[model samples]
Target chain A: SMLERTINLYPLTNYTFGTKEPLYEKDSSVAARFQRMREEFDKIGMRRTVEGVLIVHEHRLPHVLLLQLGTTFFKLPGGELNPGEDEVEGLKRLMTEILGRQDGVLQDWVIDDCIGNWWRPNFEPPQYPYIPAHITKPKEHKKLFLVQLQEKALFAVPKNYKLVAAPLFELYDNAPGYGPIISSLPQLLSRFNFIYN
Target chain B: SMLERTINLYPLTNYTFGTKEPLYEKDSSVAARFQRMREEFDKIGMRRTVEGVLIVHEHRLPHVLLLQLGTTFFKLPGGELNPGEDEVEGLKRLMTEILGRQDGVLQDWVIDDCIGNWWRPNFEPPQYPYIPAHITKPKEHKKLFLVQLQEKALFAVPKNYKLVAAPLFELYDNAPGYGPIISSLPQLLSRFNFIYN
Candidate 1:
């Protein structure tokens, strides 16, 4: 197999409208909510907005460590795409800025699925009285891409970073505090005894 | 091999920007002048503006028909894409609008090479005295995509529509327009020729 079983990898890419969401009832109100967001996007004239969590892997492992140095959420350093820059170039430039390193970044991959879940700024609820569902738009349209480490030194972790390990099954579980699923990534990767090298 | 040579099936599609010179070069200057007319696109508070081209292809036979349709020159029927449509979807939508038909319009593969070319709305010098080059500036940004037939059909030419059979390589060359190169579709299929069905 191209990806050996020993390869332990972690993924933290954003979800987009096109990503598959099977856990949610196939024809539920929530699913309809997503379709509505897609229509709204059409009205705005933007095709799709993609976001991803950067991973830093220090060892010969399949997974990279996830980081939250985000351009969308934080006042990151990069500028929005200028008038003439291609969209792909714009995103690549932004990700490179946030991660503070550019080596081994991936340019293409199949999107696993679009995912939406509860998590907020500073790892805290945004409001005084936190309603998990209300914390952020439930139907966020985002997609994630996976990156492989070419070398151990390419792994990067920013200062004061909060890492989360989440399972695919939980993103659709509809249970409270999906945060644990998001936060337990390290342990999970370790359990798999996965090594890319 | 899925491609039967007798059928003359073009198994691949490839696109490259035209070399600007002479008439095409003159058109570039005229297009540049037009950009100045819409200076507000540069204003900070003004609505965002983007430029894209609709490529229409004539289906079937010795020479497959291809035309890049747009308002920049001929008042093309397709309007700008809403804020964020994938380049592929944007092209497909435009094809449907012109044909007054849907479903079968998008069988052709489409790719978005955002920085593939630098000059758009190439201001070829207008043959008519009334259309002055100073009236427009050659647009510098453009989104280009391809559309193909669902199942092969002889091209249905519109009334008063003119078809130009521009051969790829002049009489002396073998490498011609996208036809010969793409008919060989290298990535997904192998190049094979057959004398009989």
Candidate 2:
């Protein structure tokens, strides 16, 4: 019964990420992104978003791969799925778009396990693990999946954005920095038995 | 590979809880509990506490079994571990002491998963997922484990206290109600694909 008992994490030396052509978000600006979100809200009842958690070990501790937009803001390597799009398929597509190698080489991201889920009650900032009893409809439902990396692979990072590997301690309970969804990752990921290779 | 892909949760009706005898806390009062802790702190350095998470489902959503003390305070079925005590063994002893049958019968509680860990920086109310670097020595370290129940069993609860089944929504984002460790169950538990049996 091949169930997933533990997650195997390889050392940082096994994988490498290099710079590639800059990839831009769908919207040009943050304000325009929200403005378009509101416009799209009228068409799509609720937004379905997915994020991929990539793991690599340094000093026997797991480090999460985060995409840094500015000096402070950090995000996972994924984006919103299309209308009636499969969650896993869309996440693969988005991950390939953001971090896949470009120079005639193809990278396959194996996403099997769904780690956590969050629901945004309003168009505002707060996103919770479970929908509050008071709120009937949530604005966006985001699911985070564990993206398996092969033993040896190369990732092409975007020129404009920087990809950083943040340790579990740095993100644990640091809601002020990583936001609720990302901050709770330490606890959300604690259940797994991570074997450091 | 016989890996664990998902957790199997039984319906609430499958289990039975009946009061066979009243169990008392090792410490008489809250002040007494902490007072002894300070006394023990001098010898043992830091305290190691373990709590168990027993899950049962109602209406297809998972619910945590909580032991309610007095009117407001609620706790999991666990207590302090002795110095250098095996975590799983201590948790088993604590669970049976709190909710085991009084009759001469053996119950095997399958505990193979460590769900989450919390640390009390000081001897105060605050507990965090990761120990903040500022604190040189943490006062207490708490590890939470997932307790697996068999198909059916009877539990003898203390007459004074009431055992309540708290739904995921009730515990989710409810720090004030269930405190940090218990409140984060929804997030910590989100990884497991629970099969409602």
Point to the candidate with the largest lDDT: 2
Question: Which portions of model 1 show Cα errors greater than 4 Å?
Answer: A1-197, B1-37, B43-64, B68-80, B101-139, B154-160, B170-197
Question: Predicted chain A of model 2: TM-score relative to the true chain A?
Answer: 0.93
Question: lDDT (CA) for every model shown?
Answer: 0.30, 0.81
Instruction: Report lDDT (Cα) of residue B133, candidate 1.
Output: 27
Residue A62 error for model 1, in Å? 29
Q: Which ten residues in a row have the lowest lDDT in candidate 2 chain A?
A: A1-10
> Could you tell me the TM-score of candidate 2?
0.78
Error of 1 at B58 (Å): 13
lDDT of 2 by residue, B1-197 (tens): 11124788998999988985566777887788778778888898899898999999876767899998757689998988988788888888888888878895877998877777777887566787766666778989888888888878888889878889998888876887877788889888765667889
Kindly list the per-residue Cα lDDT of model 1 for residues A1-197, writing each as its tens digit.
Answer: 01111323433232111211111122346457457546654555222333443333323223333333322112112233444454445555655544433345543422221111122222222311011322333222222222332323232334434334323323222224333323222222221223433
Query: lDDT tens string, model 1, B1-197?
Result: 02111222342133222222111221246457556435534542122122222222223212224333321222222334445565456655654444332234333533332211112333232121011224354423333222322223333223333323332112111214332222211110111121211
* Candidate 2 lDDT over residue span A55-117, tens digit each: 998767789989998575799989899898988889988988898877857787788777787
Error of 1 at A60 (Å): 28
